[PDB]
């Protein structure tokens, strides 16, 4: 199990007195070595106003066209600019990507314009920046430290409520396939 990405990180409360270890990662991305995460330890609220400040500046963003936010969450302190929005699947959308089945990833502006006239799929999430496995790329050695990892899946993910989430993922079963590997285009 010594690959980190496509699954979540169960951490037992062994860390405690700190809001930023411990708890169910998420790691989307896969530095080799590393691997690029989001937090989704509690659904907390980000208030719209920074989000403002952020689309304020019309460099590599633009399009503050959303209505409002308030609870928006963060799945970490750096990229807070973007981070990566999860909503179920659908075919459709301008910005949607989906490795299996279950879910679709969408880039947090477009979205945002999309807040501003409410038609929900079903149930979607908004968040924010990543962990700061960046300055890591040490989460191979993690890995095998303490924390555990088991495969990720679009109800466990999503559907799962919030706290039984922990419960079934802390169950689970096994899975072991990986039918991906392209890179095409130079943009």
């Given at each position: 199990?010594?690959?980190?990405?496509?699954?979540?990180?169960?951490?037992?409360?062994?860390?405690?007195?700190?809001?930023?270890?411990?708890?169910?990662?998420?790691?989307?991305?896969?530095?080799?070595?590393?691997?690029?995460?989001?937090?989704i330890?509690?659904?907390?609220?980000?208030?719209?106003?920074?989000?403002?400040?952020?689309?304020?500046?019309?460099?590599?963003?633009?399009s503050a066209d959303?209505?409002?936010?308030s609870?928006?969450?963060?799945?970490?302190?750096?990229?807070?600019?973007?981070?990566?929005?999860?909503?179920?699947?659908?075919?459709?959308w301008?910005?949607?990507?989906?490795?299996?089945?279950?879910?679709?990833l969408?880039t947090?502006?477009?979205?945002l314009?999309?807040i501003?006239?409410?038609?929900?799929?079903?149930?979607?999430?908004?968040?924010?920046?990543?962990?700061?496995?960046?300055?890591?790329?040490?989460?191979?050695?993690?890995?095998?430290?303490?924390?555990?990892?088991?495969?990720?899946?679009?109800?466990?993910l999503?559907?799962?409520?919030?706290?039984?989430?922990?419960?079934?993922?802390?169950r689970?079963?096994?899975?072991?396939?990986?039918?991906?590997?392209?890179?095409?285009?130079?943009?």
């Amino acid at each position: 199990m010594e690959s980190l990405q496509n699954h979540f990180l169960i951490a037992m409360p062994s860390l405690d007195d700190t809001f930023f270890e411990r708890t169910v990662i998420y790691l989307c991305e896969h530095d080799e070595k590393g691997a690029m995460g989001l937090v989704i330890n509690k659904p907390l609220g980000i208030e719209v106003n920074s989000l403002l400040e952020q689309m304020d500046l019309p460099t590599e963003q633009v399009s503050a066209d959303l209505a409002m936010g308030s609870q928006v969450l963060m799945g970490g302190p750096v990229s807070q600019d973007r981070g990566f929005v999860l909503h179920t699947s659908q075919p459709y959308w301008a910005n949607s990507t989906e490795l299996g089945s279950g879910l679709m990833l969408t880039t947090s502006r477009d979205v945002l314009t999309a807040i501003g006239s409410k038609r929900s799929p079903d149930k979607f999430l908004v968040a924010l920046g990543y962990a700061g496995w960046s300055k890591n790329q040490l989460e191979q050695e993690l890995a095998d430290n303490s924390w555990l990892t088991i495969p990720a899946d679009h109800a466990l993910l999503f559907d799962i409520n919030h706290e039984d989430r922990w419960q079934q993922a802390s169950r689970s079963l096994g899975f072991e396939a990986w039918q991906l590997s392209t890179q095409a285009g130079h943009a």
